[PDB]
Swiss-Prot record:
Official protein name in the record: Muscarinic toxin alpha
Function as written in the Swiss-Prot or TrEMBL entry: Selectively binds with high-affinity to the a2B-adrenoceptor subtype (ADRA2B). The toxin reversibly binds to ADRA2B, and its mode of inhibition is non-competitive. The toxin has also been described to bind with high affinity to all muscarinic receptor subtypes (Ki=23 nM (on CHRM1), Ki=44 nM (on CHRM2), Ki=3 nM (on CHRM3), Ki=5 nM (on CHRM4), and Ki=8 nM (on CHRM5)) but no other data support these affinity values.
Other facts noted in the record for this chain: Negative results: does not affect most adrenoceptors (ADRA1A, ADRA1B, ADRA2A and ADRA2C) and muscarinic receptors. Does not affect beta-1 (ADRB1) and beta-2 (ADRB2) adrenoceptors.
Disulfide bonds: C4-C25, C18-C43, C47-C59, C60-C65
GO cellular component, as recorded: extracellular region
Top-level taxon of the source organism: Eukaryota
Keyword terms, alphabetized: Disulfide bond, G-protein coupled receptor impairing toxin, Neurotoxin, Postsynaptic neurotoxin, Secreted, Toxin
GO molecular function: toxin activity
PROSITE patterns to which the protein is assigned, alphabetical: SNAKE_TOXIN (PS00272)
Family membership noted in the UniProt record: Belongs to the three-finger toxin family. Short-chain subfamily. Aminergic toxin sub-subfamily.
Transmembrane portions of the chain: none
Length: 67
């Protein structure tokens, strides 16, 4: 099984066991003119493709790799 970060903050780091078939962790955010969106973390079955040029998406395959 795989375990991924699902949210991270100064109050703590949350992880979750991915269900069968979701064998990737991801981390994503958007950037525009020196502003960043909130970061999103989770499990996924396929690496989501960026919906636009402002999005950065990073996927990986081992426990807690998406921190």
């Amino acid at each position: 099984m795989l375990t991924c970060v699902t949210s991270k903050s100064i109050f703590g780091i949350t992880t979750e066991n991915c269900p069968d078939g979701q064998n990737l962790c991801f981390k994503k955010w958007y950037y525009l003119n020196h502003r960043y969106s909130d970061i999103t973390w989770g499990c996924a079955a396929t690496c989501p493709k960026p919906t636009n040029v402002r999005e950065t998406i990073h996927c990986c395959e081992t426990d807690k790799c998406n921190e």
